[PDB]
Amino acid sequence: ETQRKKLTVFFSDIRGFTELSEELEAEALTDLLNNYLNEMSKIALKYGGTIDKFVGDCVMVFFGDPSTQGAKKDAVAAVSMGIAMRKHMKVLRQQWRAQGITKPLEIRMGINTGYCTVGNFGADTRMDYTIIGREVNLASRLESASEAGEILISHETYSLIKDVIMCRDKGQIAVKGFSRPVQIYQVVDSRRDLG
Template identity: 65%
Template sequence: MTSMTKKKARRPQLGPMERARRQANYIRLLAFLVAAMILMAGLKLNLFPELYMLGVAGLLIYPMSAQGLLFLFDKQDRPTKTVHQLLMQADAMVIGLVCALLHFALVPAMVLLIIVHANSVSSGGLKPWLLNVLMTGVGALLMGWMLGFQVLSPEQTPVLLSVISMLGLGIYVGASSAFAHLQARYLKQAQELVGRQQKQAVDMSRKLAKYLPPQVWGSIFSGKRDAKLETRRKRLTVFFSDIKGFSAISEELPLTTLTKMLNTYLSEMTRIALRHGGTIDKFIGDAVMIFFGDPKSEGAQEDAYRCVLMAIEMQEQMKLLRQRWQREGIDHKLEIRIGINTGYATVGNFGTDSRMD
């Protein structure tokens, strides 16, 4: 016996758009089932010759063929939008043929016209609907010409045929309403999915932004700079700084105190650098590397001027930080050393396709 603990293979879940397309195919099938039902009722009431059974068979075969064509295109990853539009016009032409087969009986013909044209308006809009009207007329004229334009007057139309037609219309309207409700739900699910993905992307970009200079992050996410290996020569003003005697101090201070002090220092230096437009390249322990001139530049002279102003402000800020640390019990007289140079450098992305700097 087959083990009861064996799990059944799960079918892959369909996306909202795929489910909506399948629902649309079911609605097409239902529309032609209604048409076949009306024509079959006319045959049972002896209004039409037995040869019209071929028309009933065609109304049952056509939607199956249309669904098979859509499935074939979808399986081959070919665009199905054009096929959908062509099938919509073919639907209208077939309904025109059926109206002629019904000898243009008023109520049955009106029911079929309402079905096909309501579907075209809801699915395509005004332009496809006008084309649908044309194709319906072509189908009706073609079949009417072949049959000699026989017309069944309202007095000759049995009440039962009209009742069956209205019943078919009611079934179609109910199914279409349910389909519209499902489409709205699928659309809501798709919007919620897109919203979650956008939120995840925003959260991820905010996290990644903390590891990149704001200028570099902004140029990448705006599309101005691509993440590929490329370099170029530019004139930069480069700033280096470190804390004098920091290695010795790090051996004396407790880890928590050292971490708090270093984070405070780097936060203050970062704030000043960003205010002056500097691109923070990296932190190496207590050392800071900043450059001016890439990815944005105000000109070599202005870049150098801003860098010097930044360095002066950092020195002034360091005096305030020493006073603060002294109040917290850190008696070491911390000073920063700064080096600035202006010249041509090769800038860009270095490394490999999987890891760049």
Template identity: 55%
Template structure:
């Protein structure tokens, strides 16, 4: 519209120098302030040229152009320019102020929504909340079957302890314990499913996974870190006058169903399956401060962790005897120090030892047999010299005869 007005005006004044210059200046000033693209400016200029030609042809005629401007027209033109700039700046200031207010309003709303989202995220697993915020997951009833590693732990004797503590002390101990354990789980990128009193259900493999084997190793390493942290907490609590507390942990690996369960208006992201129940039963069967794992988990982590076999046990809700392992520590330094398999053969000697097949109650008998072998080898070593010739006892040895001494005696 501005281009049409300017084109008609310039045709009316026959391109007098001062009005023409000021009109073009005002037009380009407005275009730059409005941040109009170069292509639009070119199209507008072409439209203005066409309107100027048509106005000249049909309205004002082809009179001499570029004549000197009269003093009155010059003054009027300059006053118009001043008014144009003043009014333009006024409306531009109002527009900028309005945009700034809208931007601040949207920023405040976004900050408020982010604060609300952060508060709500504390009631759901961090990985799930991040997936939903990134648009990678939807809040709807769905689940999937995956091979995952499940972790279950609780505080031994916490139920009895709750009968002796006042609610405030009980809440302090529980929140202190859960906050530290959850922070460790976060470091290992685990998904914290739920808290059930002093019990914690954690799993690896969804929504983020590093592979089944690495998930199992991360879970076991997390359990070791929790056991170490519990030692520190136990010492601190003892100094505060509380009784010593210990944890029990169970880990199992297998196929589970994970996803959103419930109703459309109230759902929970959780995991279900046999191995969830197995992890809970292993935790219940574990001794204090023990990490008890299933054989499936052991097969995935045995290259990185030292484990001791346990007697197969029967667990409630689990069919048949369950082979279990106790996690001792993570391998450090030379793995030969924790070698599980020995196969050594030499002339007259062949030893095959697989510690993975030996139960802990069989260790004394195994040590006794090996000690007998060592003792017999030591005895045999005293009966044979370095050349392999049998040695007589000292009293049976025959002294060598010196012929020169016998001749002297004769």
């Protein structure tokens, strides 16, 4: 049964991937995307996230449902997962460069925390447990605004993580579907990161 719950919601994609998909053999592309998605899946499991879906190279993970550590630990877990994924991308790039893939590929991420609706949604032979709401769309918009290599979070997320994860103010951006400007921050790796 569908509920309204405070979640931290994470989106990511690989900048450079679409270009890569127009020049790799289909089999090498399949293996590179699936390797990536499998490695990202393992990191999301480690950090306690709920993997929602993949849309090509786009990954959506949420924290706070079906279980929760409370809003602060859920947010710390989501951002720490992103820190960890960005570090693991360096490893994957080294592996890829060894297969002769040279074109640059970099993860970007958007994270927001707020109340979301969670439930089973879909058509009768095509149902999924997933989330919807403005706060879900705000995570997606942060991801769209982020630069290669950047993890962008909203002020609500920052408020939760600021004593334990190092951030830097990146101003306020124009987000379509958002009249008012939303405060954003970059997440910066530091000595006390959880991993």
